[PDB]
Amino acid sequence: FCRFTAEGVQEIDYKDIATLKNYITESGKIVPSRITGTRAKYQRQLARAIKRARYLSLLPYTDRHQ
Amino acid sequence: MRHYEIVFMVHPDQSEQVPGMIERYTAAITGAEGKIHRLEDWGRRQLAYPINKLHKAHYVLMNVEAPQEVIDELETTFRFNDAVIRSMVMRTKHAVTEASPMVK
Amino acid sequence: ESFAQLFEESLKEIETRPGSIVRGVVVAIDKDVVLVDAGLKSESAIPAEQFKNAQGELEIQVGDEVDVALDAVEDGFGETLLSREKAKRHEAWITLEKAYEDAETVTGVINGKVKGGFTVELNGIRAFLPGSLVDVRPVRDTLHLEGKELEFKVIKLDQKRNNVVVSRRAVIESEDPWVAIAKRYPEGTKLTGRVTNLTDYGCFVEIEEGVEGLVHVSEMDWTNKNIHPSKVVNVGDVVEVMVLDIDEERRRISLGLKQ
Amino acid sequence: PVIKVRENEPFDVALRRFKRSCEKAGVLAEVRRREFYEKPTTERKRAKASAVKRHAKKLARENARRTRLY
Amino acid sequence: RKQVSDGVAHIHASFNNTIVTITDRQGNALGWATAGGSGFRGSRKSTPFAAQVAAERCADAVKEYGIKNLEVMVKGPGPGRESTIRALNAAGFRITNITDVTPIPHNGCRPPKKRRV
Amino acid sequence: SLSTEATAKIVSEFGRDANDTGSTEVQVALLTAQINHLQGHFAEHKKDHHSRRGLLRMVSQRRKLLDYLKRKDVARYTQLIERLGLRR
RNA sequence: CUUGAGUCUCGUAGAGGGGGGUAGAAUUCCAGGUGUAGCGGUGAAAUGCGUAGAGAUCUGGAGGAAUACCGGUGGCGAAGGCGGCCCCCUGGACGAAGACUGACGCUCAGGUGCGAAAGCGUGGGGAGCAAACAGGAUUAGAUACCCUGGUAGUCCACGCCGUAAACGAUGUCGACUUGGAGGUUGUGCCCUUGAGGCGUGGCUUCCGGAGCUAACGCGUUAAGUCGACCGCCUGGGGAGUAC
């Protein structure tokens, strides 16, 4: 039950923070493709986006850090 | 030539200097017959974690179709400039002119 | 000849996949198993509990016709998913009928809110609706004679996940689950959900528009460990459950049943 | 697993919640894993072995199930 | 000594020994106690009970500071983790936040070799 | 890889029809250009072994093509090797 | 001549390679604050570190190495192998249609290259880990297993080494022979009326038929049915040793 297949997105955006936030943990970790049911191709992209965000301090690497 | 996408983060005390910097950056791009497809001052923004001890910073997005030499130059400038904390020049396939989801 | 080919496309034309065409004739009854034959590869092992109406006793003898459902084929040997869901489509059609004249009228009798909306029951089935839907104003059916007779005037429906809150008394008055997972959230919003499969640690009640709930083994009852959930509740049945916990991230809404 | 006790929330309940959060995180498990160095080979082996086991559980057992026990 | 209303309890829970340290909110330690210090050795001090008693001791030690509110930070794997916090609660502080602060590297340093037993 | 425009140019010059592209000579030329390009790269990056494998393969292919040309039609081959400046 | 082989067009996914940047977590050390008697470790201990203020805790700094989550009997690579993020240079694979070349092919003794880990050379680096070494245990002994330390080395540059259960213990290339359940990555049509429906390609995991096999098993990714080329075996030891 993938979101990105239905939406039909060409590429996942690191700037689209809200969307990312659904796929990240309360502890900051990226959520598995088993749980979200994201398609494999998209999942990787999502992960990459998240990573990018983390570099730009848009998303946090973890809950504890400060 | 090659469609880059740049996002740089300025120190929040230098927020009034930002426009000038942006202008300068644009100018350089223009110089080598480089187009600038979108440009979005995101403004002051709360950081997810405190980079270099400070909690807010001033984000500027900028999409550019420029030659790589100029990109390199820009990068160099960023690295030496102390106002800009982070940058992230990042290649892209197309021009991507439509606005960002956080501006909208 | 092409008699058979034409007969095949004919028989394709005179059946469909869901429980739509009331076709299976009840050809053997024995407690506790009904069985039909809707022009499928095999006969259904029907429960008796998809066919007794509103007070417990059976209603249909030999020859009687209800459609069942489909789109699932062969678990080893056999054919269907149950006809009772069939019924849900009919209920949906009546609810939809409202749209035409902007008023579906039956009887709705709603005594109380498990999760903020009085429960309304139509015919055999009982549904849960959001708190406003029960009363047109601030009248509140707590002062009304218990389990009173009105109809249901619809207040709110969730259109994907099936929750419908309907309008008792006052006759005169006339990606997708996981972003905004804050509706049934706040601590203990009770829900009516059909269980799906009980995995010897769990029960997997999950109804609210493409989610997954567990009610695992620890609550379920007021005995902890010796319980074995297949003995204690059911298979395929709409029950008392509420959230107790949501993680919108690692999609594990951890419902409960000891409440 | 950062948590804040809600207004008029019991202590025990809070503790339980915290525990749950911890479990979700898989923090303890992670710690256990990083106690000692696992050779890459060993890590590989476990992963594949585990996978194999899972597969066995899923299919062979299902086949068994088809036939009644008594 | 200056009295303080709110502070932190740091619970360092190892496999061998629990260490409870009550501090002010800024970082400055007020008191501490350990399962090894509480009169438990080897088998005994690596237990929940031991941890609890250490916690209790710690609480007793920071009586003079007059601490009412308390946020707990739990570190490491151990028995003294749930037990310790329970003990603290019993001792009678309003537990405000319960945080986990185990140091998880993001694959950094090589751990020591696996024991052959 | 070789840029599209460059490739096109190469095809036009050596290919008789200019739409042909698959002419032996044309192919050889294409290979040769690529090899030349990669020389610069490999001067810089001596440990890039994987990449060098591809280059080697290309070279081999070119050689094969040349050989084929030789047996078929000598004059053409000679011309080609004059144009490209291939010692053999 | 165009079916093999290759070239061109447009896309596609990728831990493929080389180079240069950078990010965050964690360990270690240094400086300082708070604080007070233990810490650490084990099966149990002790060596060890601690009132010369350790351990704990907070602040600041240094430096190195590796990249949690994603992450998968997932992907890429001839094999060895390859995993944060960004850029530059760069090799291959696959699909979609066309267009072209016209057997240009397959295999390969010698030959040439690439080739984990350890190891060697010269110059750097050195956090963690740790052969050697030392002490403490255990023991009849313990030149081990366990504990506390700990140097080569691991890291980088450029050379050499040329081996591994370098394994699918299965040479490469091509053709042909019943099925099922998946994964991954394209792509054509179809009301995408929805996460779908019907195909068609590539790579891939498991089960199983005929057949094959000493049996175990293999089974369209063959260990089946055949062809082409090469490599290799001829009882165990002596020996992959001596010269």
UniProtKB/Swiss-Prot annotation, chain E:
The protein's name: Small ribosomal subunit protein uS11
Transmembrane segment boundaries: none
InterPro entries referenced in this protein's UniProt entry, alphabetically: Ribosomal_uS11, Ribosomal_uS11_bac-type, Ribosomal_uS11_CS, Ribosomal_uS11_sf
Gene Ontology biological process terms from the UniProt entry: translation
HAMAP family: Ribosomal_uS11 (MF_01310)
Highest taxon above the source species: Bacteria
UniProt cross-references to PROSITE patterns, sorted A to Z: RIBOSOMAL_S11
One Gene Ontology MF term: rRNA binding
Role, per record: Located on the platform of the 30S subunit, it bridges several disparate RNA helices of the 16S rRNA. Forms part of the Shine-Dalgarno cleft in the 70S ribosome.
GO cellular component term, pick one: ribonucleoprotein complex
Record family assignment: Belongs to the universal ribosomal protein uS11 family.
A family per Pfam: Ribosomal_S11
Subunit field text: Part of the 30S ribosomal subunit. Interacts with proteins S7 and S18. Binds to IF-3.
Provenance organism: Escherichia coli O45:K1 (strain S88 / ExPEC)
Entry keyword set: Ribonucleoprotein, Ribosomal protein, RNA-binding, rRNA-binding
